[PDB]
């Protein structure tokens, strides 16, 4: 329905251990399709999804050079940020940037975004109007000046409203059989004794995509979520995700509890019980 | 496809 492309950049300075490290990953929704690591022996842009490899050398050599330059710019940024705060030379510091485009169901750019952090702190962000920036402190205001002189915003509006949307539509078509094929979760309920009169009911959800999901436990049909245990949604290591939700019930009252699941691939919600 | 090359901070 509503898709998006996202890039994540990380640069970490490691004084006395080489030049800063630069990593970049690209996602289409929850599916990573590109990776670049500046520490690899052959640093190049490598495909991570089977719907981008058929692009040809022109496309991949263009990303490699793109990333190799970006890693040099981030090394400049680390020195500049360091100098803005009068930070020691023997300290390790982190720069992060995240940008992408949300392709609304209308098939057009619903919104673009670009934000950065320094040492885990919001530094500078591109505003929703794609025309200006919002700066956290006085150091980010120096950065804003430099980007304003460079017309950086005009280049981001052109990228987010054009290239970003244009290639997101291209990726979705090439990988329609997976990016647009939602996958419902495989579910079941397990039983584990706690005490002589206590038992745990764990509701499992396995092998679904995208990761968005909701698991709910109900006794008698109410929202018995004050004593429910939820683990963060987690990856299976192959494109699908996992998630379970547990509740401690008095032994003998198992069939009083029902597990409710909500996922995009499920036409109507699924109520699941524990089969002894 | 990624942004070409950002300006330095």
């Amino acid at each position, epitope marked *: 329905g509503s898709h998006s492309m996202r890039y994540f950049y990380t640069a970490v300075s490691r004084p006395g251990r080489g030049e800063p490290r630069f990593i970049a990953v690209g996602y289409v929704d929850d599916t990573q399709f590109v990776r670049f690591d500046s520490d690899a022996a052959s640093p190049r842009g490598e495909p991570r999804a089977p719907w981008v490899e058929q692009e040809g050398p022109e496309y991949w050599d263009r990303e490699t050079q793109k990333y190799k330059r970006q890693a040099q710019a981030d090394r400049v940024s680390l020195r500049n940020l360091r100098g803005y705060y009068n930070q020691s030379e023997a300290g390790s510091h982190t720069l992060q940037r995240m940008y992408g485009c949300d392709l609304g169901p209308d098939g057009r750019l619903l919104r673009g975004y670009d934000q950065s952090a320094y040492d885990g702190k919001d530094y500078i962000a591109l505003n929703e109007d794609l025309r200006s920036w919002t700066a956290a402190d006085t150091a980010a205001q120096i950065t804003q000046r430099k980007w304003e*002189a460079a017309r950086e915003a005009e280049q981001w509006r052109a990228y987010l409203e054009g290239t970003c949307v244009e290639w997101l539509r291209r990726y979705l078509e090439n990988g329609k059989e997976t990016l647009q094929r939602a996958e419902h979760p495989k579910t079941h309920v397990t039983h584990h004794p706690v005490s002589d009169h206590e038992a745990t009911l764990r509701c499992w959800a396995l092998g679904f995509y995208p990761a968005e999901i909701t698991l709910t436990w109900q006794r008698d049909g109410e929202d018995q979520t004050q004593d429910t245990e939820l683990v963060e949604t987690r990856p299976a290591g192959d494109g699908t995700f996992q998630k379970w939700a547990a509740v401690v019930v008095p032994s003998g009252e198992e069939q009083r509890y029902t597990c409710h699941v909500q996922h995009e691939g499920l036409p109507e919600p699924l109520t699941l019980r524990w089969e002894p | 496809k990624a942004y070409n090359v950002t300006q330095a901070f």
Partner: T-cell receptor
Amino acid sequence: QSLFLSVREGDSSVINCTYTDSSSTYLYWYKQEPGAGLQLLTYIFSNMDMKQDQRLTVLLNKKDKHLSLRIADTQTGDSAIYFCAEVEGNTPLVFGKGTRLSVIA
Amino acid sequence: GAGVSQSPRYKVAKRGQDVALRCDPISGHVSLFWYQQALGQGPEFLTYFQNEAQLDKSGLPSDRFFAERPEGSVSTLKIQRTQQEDSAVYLCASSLAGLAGGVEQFFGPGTRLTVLE
């Protein structure tokens, strides 16, 4: 001087080129006279259709990746080599093949 | 000649000797570019700088070429064991910050380097 174009004084000249990357955010026109350096003529933002400044008119046509420069009332001082250039982000200009414009007096 | 300066302008060098080319960009400009140019052909990329950092040097055709920019102002392109194939014009350009449309930019007059036997 990969291509050649001859125009009469007082007429109009039209230079064309097909740039490479459709993601180019700015298209440029430079002219180089014999022995001199490159002179910036104009630039157009890739989201605009056309731009004008004095006797110069730039026409952009994305998808086809076609850029055109029209010199109005072309005069002998216009004889030179004209180059297409594209740029996206914080990268160097990428220049196309040149076109030598020869004005017949 | 108001703008960027390039020192040698014209240079003759015999096959084997070394040569150094100098570029004097506008004081405030952050980025600086080096190009190569053959007889009436489009300029080709060599390398460019962000302040004093070299963002890319893939354009250099041989390891004998070495550009640098110590304190982010003057730039120098050195060539060792110059060959006949090195004969060409070497252009320098500087801009306030990147080359986006409307940002101040200047190309240098260039330096024609003839390598003679």
